[PDB]
From Swiss-Prot, chains A, B:
It is found in: Host cytoplasm. Changing residue 26 to E: Complete loss of activity at neutral pH; covalently bound substrate. Its EC number is 3.2.1.17. The lineage of its organism: Viruses, Duplodnaviria, Heunggongvirae, Uroviricota, Caudoviricetes. Changing residue 20 to A/N/S/T: Complete loss of enzymatic activity. GO terms for cellular component: host cell cytoplasm. Substrate binds at residues 32, 104, 117, 132. This is Endolysin. It catalyses: Hydrolysis of (1->4)-beta-linkages between N-acetylmuramic acid and N-acetyl-D-glucosamine residues in a peptidoglycan and between N-acetyl-D-glucosamine residues in chitodextrins. The keyword Hydrolase applies.
Length: 164, 164
């Protein structure tokens, strides 16, 4: 278990253009193509992203390539963020992944917004952070994934991904 | 200082197609475009990867998208490699970056062939590893960069990147 396997789980893998929850066009492992409602524009964005005319369908390897861009971009923006960075650098390897997971899902901006849970994490107050995180709109919106992310922060283990 | 800042120094950032050492067309931060002697070929690879007609020049942001791709690809490849993985998992965060740096530079296969220096690192035999690594053709080919990566494995500090 690592961040790659962990997001693949939380995000899944689709090789055809699909609509996420707010219904925008998406492919691979949670890779947003466009906010434009035109599926002709999503198919042209996609051909652009992948470097070939795909006719709406990609391979596993092409999806993993977008995924590598997205995860490292996630990590890079954590490191360039005044607020996320000292938390991330304080965290152990498993817990860093939990943090990467949240940034991947909701962006560096909304993760930098968790002022008090971030402080609890920075102070190593795992149980308080876990409780505080559970109260968020984020949790209330995707409670299955959030609870799995919060168990990772709480325990520093890969338990919430074992069985499944 | 992290793996991103460390490979930026090590590889530099070139926004225009250049020729690397085995004289292969390259752009961004050590991004290999092609092994065609042709330039319009390398220009057509670049266009494909970036998604616009570049005519051999890119932005910082474009170079960083490719860089993000290459780094996480380097990490995923460590994690999928039966010899690199347990070494990587055993290493602290600084020295992990040293291993990522090697893999970024010469690929997963050629790093997985450092049989005996890999084993020394897994056993925390830092000086012994540092000494063995300095005897490599790799070190002989790019000694400045190699010595800096070997200092990081050795000390697990960022000393070799501090005063450059």
């Amino acid at each position: 278990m690592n961040i790659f396997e962990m997001l693949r789980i939380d995000e899944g893998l689709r090789l055809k253009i699909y609509k996420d929850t707010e219904g925008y066009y998406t492919i691979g492992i949670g890779h947003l193509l466009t906010k434009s409602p035109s599926l002709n524009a999503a198919k042209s964005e996609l051909d652009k992203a992948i470097g070939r005319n795909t006719n709406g369908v990609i391979t596993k390897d092409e999806a993993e390539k977008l995924f590598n861009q997205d995860v490292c971009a996630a990590v890079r923006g954590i490191l360039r963020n005044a607020k996320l960075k000292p938390v991330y650098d304080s965290l152990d390897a498993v817990r860093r992944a939990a943090l990467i997971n949240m940034v991947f899902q909701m962006g560096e901006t909304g993760v930098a917004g968790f002022t008090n849970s971030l402080r609890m994490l920075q102070q190593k107050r795992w149980d308080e952070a876990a409780v505080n995180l559970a109260k968020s709109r984020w949790y209330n919106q995707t409670p299955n994934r959030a609870k799995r992310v919060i168990t990772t922060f709480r325990t520093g283990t890969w338990d919430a991904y074992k069985n499944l």
